[PDB]
Design a protein around this ligand. Structure first.
Ligand SMILES: CC(C)=CCC/C(C)=C/CSP(=O)(O)OP(=O)(O)O
Ligand SMILES: C=C(C)CCOP(=O)(O)OP(=O)(O)O
Ligand SMILES: C=C(C)CCOP(=O)(O)OP(=O)(O)O
Ligand SMILES: C=C(C)CCOP(=O)(O)OP(=O)(O)O
Ligand SMILES: [Mg+2]
Ligand SMILES: [Mg+2]
Lengths: 244, 244
């Protein structure tokens, strides 16, 4: 198979970020620091995420993709996974009407069939109720990883080729983008709370020219002032996309 | 159909075994010092050799260095022609000594797009060093993350088309075996030049890599800067999605 790359590919990126990506990290250490019970940080996840949607919506931000549960988090104890998947279902039922009144559209990416059936039904109902809403699109990545996303797009392309729907030479960036679960437009800014300088198998393909913002602030402490700082910082960067 | 909660292992991550290196900021280093526009680029592969020598003594086994991306074709024909001729020159003048403790050199990227003379220089550099026993230097030249994932997808589609694999055999390990940069993946990414972004480097391979961004322009990056980056790496806690 031949290659040629000096022919051309448009990058689906942008004053203001259109799409923000969010790694919601540091919730355990936030509870350890305040001497609270082990899962009390995670109880702030969905409420804070609603606060961030509110602020971002007013600034003209159109998309937020938030990392809620990765495919490697299955490595944690049965007790933690069960507690936090139950907590996610509960919080999604508690803050739903707050998200719905702001005209937020809610989508979930990840492998849903591995989740508990009650959470699968709750997710399907949330997506149905909000699919027509016209405000900010909140995408929640739940049992998601970049490896998984690329693998399921590759399988989808293989099956199409098997059924006579495409040739090997039709496989390009545009086709791949439309087979991934996180699509164009790609994140302009990634904010990771919790102090770690790494991506932890989040949106690997989608982050090719994303601007990174790592903060030391633990996620339950990330408020309107911190989001405003991150956007102003983003506005101070020069994006060249390989050109001059 | 998908399932991800059973297979929670695989992957390939004191001292980082594999360092990834984005050699950025060469234009600004020549501008700041008032030199000719391409004077910084003449330092790229000499300094890269110096980094390999230091890295070899500390026990590092692999360096993957970004020398020319698939989006850099967007720059002026003058700059691109000058820089590809300069790479051909630098690649002949260094990486020549008969010492067996020197680096083994591979090139990843689409070589057929490059000037014929540079193609011949690359072939000669890979042949003369294939027996060397030191550090494996991989030079990423006309390379990008999209390109790497796309060519692996095309190779998998081809095999499936020709009866050589099943769609249900497609997993992380088979995909990894089709990429140009394979397991083991970089433990540490060092980007010189002030920008906090990845610019379509090793997208799949950087899933759990530790990021180290420095403002030092690449021609000023020496032994003290490398020792600082390794020290910073050693103070980091890698969890790979797990706990306790
Ligand atoms: C939904 C499940 C099972 C887990 C939560 C995943 C999550 C929110 C991770 C980021 S916060 P976490 O890694 O728990 O907290 P730190 O150890 O980083 O302080
Ligand atoms: C080939 C190298 C060293 C990496 C790309 O850096 P660029 O200078 O092309 O990256 P951007 O700032 O354009 O993102
Ligand atoms: C090898 C390549 C293409 C990048 C080197 O630095 P640049 O050419 O990007 O210079 P700056 O604009 O970053 O200073
Ligand atoms: C927010 C989510 C779902 C993942 C956060 O990163 P992790 O806490 O899993 O990442 P590592 O620090 O283990 O890389
Ligand atoms: Mg964490
Ligand atoms: Mg640059």
């Amino acid at each position: 198979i031949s290659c040629s790359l000096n022919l051309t590919e448009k990058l689906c990126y942008e004053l203001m970020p259109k799409h923000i990506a969010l790694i919601m990290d540091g919730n355990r250490r936030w509870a350890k620091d305040k001497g609270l019970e082990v899962y009390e940080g995670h109880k702030h996840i969905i409420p804070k995420l609603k606060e961030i949607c509110d602020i971002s919506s007013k600034l003209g931000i159109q998309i937020i993709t938030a990392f809620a549960f990765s495919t490697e988090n299955w490595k944690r104890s049965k007790e933690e996974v069960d507690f936090l998947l139950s907590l996610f279902e509960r919080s999604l039922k508690t803050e739903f009407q707050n998200l719905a009144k702001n005209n937020v559209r809610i989508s979930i990416i990840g492998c849903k069939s591995d989740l508990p059936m009650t959470l699968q039904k709750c997710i399907a109902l949330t997506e149905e109720t909000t699919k027509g809403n016209k405000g900010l699109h909140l995408v929640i990545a739940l049992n998601y990883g970049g490896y998984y996303d690329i693998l399921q797009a590759t399988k989808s392309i293989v099956n199409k080729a098997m059924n006579g729907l495409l040739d090997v030479e039709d496989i390009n960036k545009n086709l791949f983008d439309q087979e991934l679960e996180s699509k164009c437009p790609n994140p302009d800014l990634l904010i990771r709370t919790g102090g770690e300088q790494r991506v932890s198998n989040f949106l690997l393909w989608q982050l090719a020219y994303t601007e990174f913002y790592f903060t030391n602030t633990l996620f339950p402490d990330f408020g309107e002032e911190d989001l405003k700082e991150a956007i102003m910082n983003f506005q101070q960067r020069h994006r060249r996309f390989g050109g001059h």
